[PDB]
Amino acid sequence: VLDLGALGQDFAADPYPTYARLRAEGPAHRVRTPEGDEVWLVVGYDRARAVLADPRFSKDWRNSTTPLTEAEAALNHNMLESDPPRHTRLRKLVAREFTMRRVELLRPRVQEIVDGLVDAMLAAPDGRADLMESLAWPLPITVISELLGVPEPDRAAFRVWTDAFVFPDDPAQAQTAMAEMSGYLSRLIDSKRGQDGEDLLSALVRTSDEDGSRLTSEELLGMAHILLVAGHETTVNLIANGMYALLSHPDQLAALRADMTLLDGAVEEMLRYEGPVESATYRFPVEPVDLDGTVIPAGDTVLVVLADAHRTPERFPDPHRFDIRRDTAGHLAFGHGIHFCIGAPLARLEARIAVRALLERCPDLALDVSPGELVWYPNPMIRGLKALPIRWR
Ligand code: HEM
Ligand SMILES: CC[C@H]1OC(=O)[C@H](C)[C@@H](O[C@H]2O[C@@H](C)C[C@@H](N(C)C)[C@@H]2O)[C@@H](C)C[C@H](C)C(=O)/C=C/[C@H]1C
Numbered sequence: 001v002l003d004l005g006a007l008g009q010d011f012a013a014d015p016y017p018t019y020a021r022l023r024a025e026g027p028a029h030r031v032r033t034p035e036g037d038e039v040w041l042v043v044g045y046d047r048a049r050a051v052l053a054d055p056r057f058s059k060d061w062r063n064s065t066t067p068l069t070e071a072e073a074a075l076n077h078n079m080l081e082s083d084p085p086r087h088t089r090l091r092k093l094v095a096r097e098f099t100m101r102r103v104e105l106l107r108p109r110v111q112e113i114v115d116g117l118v119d120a121m122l123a124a125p126d127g128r129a130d131l132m133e134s135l136a137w138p139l140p141i142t143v144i145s146e147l148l149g150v151p152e153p154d155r156a157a158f159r160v161w162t163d164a165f166v167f168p169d170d171p172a173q174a175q176t177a178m179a180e181m182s183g184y185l186s187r188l189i190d191s192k193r194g195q196d197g198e199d200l201l202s203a204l205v206r207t208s209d210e211d212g213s214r215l216t217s218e219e220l221l222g223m224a225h226i227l228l229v230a231g232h233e234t235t236v237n238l239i240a241n242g243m244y245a246l247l248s249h250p251d252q253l254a255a256l257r258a259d260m261t262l263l264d265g266a267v268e269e270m271l272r273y274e275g276p277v278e279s280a281t282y283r284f285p286v287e288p289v290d291l292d293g294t295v296i297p298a299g300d301t302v303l304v305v306l307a308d309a310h311r312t313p314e315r316f317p318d319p320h321r322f323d324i325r326r327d328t329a330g331h332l333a334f335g336h337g338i339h340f341c342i343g344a345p346l347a348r349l350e351a352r353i354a355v356r357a358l359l360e361r362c363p364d365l366a367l368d369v370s371p372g373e374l375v376w377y378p379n380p381m382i383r384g385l386k387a388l389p390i391r392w393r
Contacts (some may be wrong), residue, residue: 001030001038002018004034005033005034009378012377012378013375016311016320019041019311020043020308022041026293028042028047028296035171038301039301039303041302042302042305044312045310045314049309049330051304052335052336052339053336053337053338056287056289057302059283060082060284061081061284064282064299065284066301071176071178071182074178074179075182075221075222077221078219078223079339080226080230087338090215091342093223094223095342099345106143106147109146110143110349114357117138117139118362121135127391129389129391130389130390131358132388135239135354136243136388137236139350139354140235140236140239141155141236144227144228149201151188157180161180162229165229166382182221188224189201193209204220204223205220231346233276234276234347235350237382238271238347238351239354239355241383241384242266242270243390245269245273245274247366255325260356262324264348265328266355267348268328270351271328272310273310275307275333276383277333277383279380282302283304284298285297306332362392366391368389368391
């Protein structure tokens with residue numbers, strides 16, 4: 001039983017060697033996450049892609065040996081933590097809001113938010129800033145908050161709750177944060193009743209009130225929570241991890257600067273090279289599963305390591321090479337199967353507009369600290385930085 005906790009920041013900063021080491025012996029391994037969670041890891045691209053879409057692996061806690069806590073049980077009635085038919089029904093409720101055509105209409109506004117954030121950033125007399133605080137965090141929370149209808153003065157509370165979910169001081173902090181967020185969402189939800197709002201939450205509230213059978217109040221709350229949190233810590237880290245990748249690879253940054261039509265390709269390679277999701281969300285086998293000899297008992301917690309999949313040579317030649325011109329087709333940065341990220345088009349839009357704005361307005365943009373000085377968060381499911389110092393002329 002490998003204990004990831006005893007590996008420290010060394011493993012947090014560069015977990016790849018550890019994963020590949022495990023991939024060499026087999027596809028599934030038992031480990032102890034930093035928080036003390038005894039879980040299973042699935043490494044290797046082929047096995048990883050298969051498991052993500054293998055119906056034998058449920059996301060419904062009723063099939064999990066580990067029980068939900070009281071505060072967690074208040075938010076699990078959402079699509080990411082359910083199997084069909086519930087999943088089918090819940091996702092249908094919002095699929096239409098996230099199509100590429102629907103998201104494209106948001107381009108003008110996303111552009112506004114980015115230009116404003118960059119305007120403010122370039123106001124620094126020293127030509128220095130923390131990209132995490134100036135853009136990576138502000139952009140994502142602003143967009144999703146406007147789509148759902150979260151008042152501006154309430155958006156700060158989320159960075160706090162979100163942090164307590166990722167790198168909580170103690171187990172209790174996370175639980176308290178959930179209870180608070182849970183209480184806030186219920187109040188936000190109730191405040192929309194009778195107000196004729198046209199934001200997504202208001203529509204959902206109307207749907208639930210009209211027929212509690214199509215969307216129960218537990219699910220309304222669950223839906224509001226998943227849409228706000230599943231795309232927060234992820235888009236934030238994509239922007240930051242992606243810019244770090246570019247800034248730590250001068251040659252690639254130059255090629256993109258020279259030819260901006262490589263942008264879309266650059267963004268995909270960022271997802272594949274330094275995607276924010278190191279490990280997918282909890283899966284629980286509904287029956288004992290045998291992965292090439294290793295048997296994962298029913299009920300155990302399983303984590304598909306997307307990061308290791310992205311470094312499998314057979315799938316991505318010269319894995320450790322960050323190449324924006326590389327063939328990325330097949331990466332699992334957004335998952336695979338029925339739970340495939342519903343916010344992918346919106347994630348891609350924000351990332352594309354943010355990367356272009358920095359390259360075209362920050363002359364001689366450069367990393368303002370050495371790669372080795374950067375600090376990464378411990379949590380195995382999330383790949384993200386504590387801060388990203390940058391500078392320009
Ligand atoms: C670059 C940013 C993003 C990445 C890399 C990402 C990644 C993922 C991944 C890996 C999954 C499935 C994981 C699993 O199967 O356990 C997923 C699911 C999901 N994502 Fe994203 N996501 C991002 C942005 C977004 C955005 C912007 C939203 C919100 C608008 C969002 C909403 C969701 C939801 C609600 C699900 C559940 C889908 C379902 O269960 O049917 N994601 N995302
Ligand atoms: C969709 C990929 C990202 O994951 C999340 O957003 C997960 C689902 C979210 O997980 C947990 O949030 C709690 C508030 C409720 C809990 N459930 C038991 C009711 C749910 O599993 C994040 C808060 C967890 C991780 C740490 C994260 O920040 C994002 C990870 C992405 C992989």
